[PDB]
Amino acid sequence: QPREPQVYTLPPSQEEMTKNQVSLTCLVKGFYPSDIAVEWESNGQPENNYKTTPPVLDSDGSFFLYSRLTVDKSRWQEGNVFSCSVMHEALHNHYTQKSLSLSL
Amino acid sequence: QPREPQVYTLPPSQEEMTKNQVSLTCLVKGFYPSDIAVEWESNGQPENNYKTTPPVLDSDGSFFLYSRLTVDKSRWQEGNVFSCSVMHEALHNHYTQKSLSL
């Protein structure tokens, strides 16, 4: 049957703070079927500098993927809020979003 | 030219802790070429309950991927140390490993 995606945001590693840009991660797991859309935003505006892995088949027959938004380290360190949004047929209202920031 | 993988371990989200199993994440980014191997270990033994994404082309022409190890929450809460190891031609010794624990 359809299975609802679980969406978890994961902050950049402390070790990435030596770089000019850092990685904001959105883990989307346990979803079926594989058809899905994932996007990023901040302050209500689209954040386009991201890449998302293809869905990967898990052992339970569901799928997972990760989406990675790359941002200027200063935007992350200065407490900006980002959010990953997911569209999938097994989500209530077919939509959910999760926020990611140092300030949360 | 070849480009050295950056390897970052990320702990489970606080929101995953309501589950019986949690996800440990290994981000491997900025590597070139795409040929790479990634494995997991704990307390000096191989951990096999993981899946790794294929390499994905980044805007700068290098690749990134993620590996996800699923472990019992109890094992993570008990302080067990886990590590992601990466083999790639652009690493010193063609090998590195990064640890992750509570």
Side-chain angles (χ1 to χ4, degrees), chain A residues 2-91 93-104, chain B residues 2-14 16 18 20-101:
Chain A
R3 189 136 111 178
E4 181 180 359
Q6 312 159 35
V7 180
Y8 302 112
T9 57
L10 314 172
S13 168
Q14 275 302 302
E15 306 310 309
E16 205 177 15
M17 296 307 124
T18 66
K19 309 302 184 183
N20 289 322
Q21 294 187 314
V22 297
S23 302
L24 276 56
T25 298
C26 187
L27 163 57
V28 184
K29 56 168 282 230
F31 64 92
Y32 193 85
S34 69
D35 303 275
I36 198 165
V38 180
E39 297 180 337
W40 291 87
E41 66 186 297
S42 176
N43 285 19
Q45 305 293 339
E47 292 282 327
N48 284 325
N49 195 36
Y50 66 89
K51 286 293 197 297
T52 303
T53 71
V56 176
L57 185 59
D58 233 323
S59 56
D60 57 16
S62 71
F63 293 93
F64 77 93
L65 56 75
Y66 287 87
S67 182
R68 183 172 80 98
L69 174 66
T70 299
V71 310
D72 283 346
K73 181 173 63 186
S74 71
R75 291 181 75 206
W76 176 254
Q77 299 181 311
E78 291 173 15
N80 287 272
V81 177
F82 299 83
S83 53
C84 173
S85 58
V86 178
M87 272 243 316
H88 188 273
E89 61 199 90
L91 287 169
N93 316 313
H94 297 181
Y95 177 98
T96 192
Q97 76 175 52
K98 300 298 177 190
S99 293
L100 182 56
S101 80
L102 279 189
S103 66
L104 295 168
Chain B
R3 195 174 175 180
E4 177 190 347
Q6 304 161 44
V7 182
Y8 304 110
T9 54
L10 318 177
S13 161
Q14 287 296 348
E16 203 178 21
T18 65
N20 294 320
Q21 294 194 307
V22 298
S23 301
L24 307 200
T25 299
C26 192
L27 166 54
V28 187
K29 61 172 276 233
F31 62 93
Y32 192 85
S34 64
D35 308 82
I36 196 164
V38 180
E39 297 174 9
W40 288 87
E41 279 186 5
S42 170
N43 296 125
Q45 297 296 324
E47 291 280 323
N48 194 34
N49 201 23
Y50 67 87
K51 282 298 195 306
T52 305
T53 77
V56 182
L57 183 56
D58 225 320
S59 61
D60 56 17
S62 69
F63 294 92
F64 74 91
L65 57 76
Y66 287 88
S67 182
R68 186 174 77 96
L69 174 68
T70 300
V71 301
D72 287 341
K73 190 166 63 188
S74 61
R75 297 185 64 211
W76 173 255
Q77 304 275 62
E78 279 173 354
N80 289 91
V81 175
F82 294 88
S83 61
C84 172
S85 58
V86 177
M87 291 210 69
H88 188 272
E89 65 198 80
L91 291 169
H92 179 59
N93 305 134
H94 300 167
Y95 180 96
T96 193
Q97 64 161 11
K98 301 293 177 187
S99 297
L100 177 69
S101 70

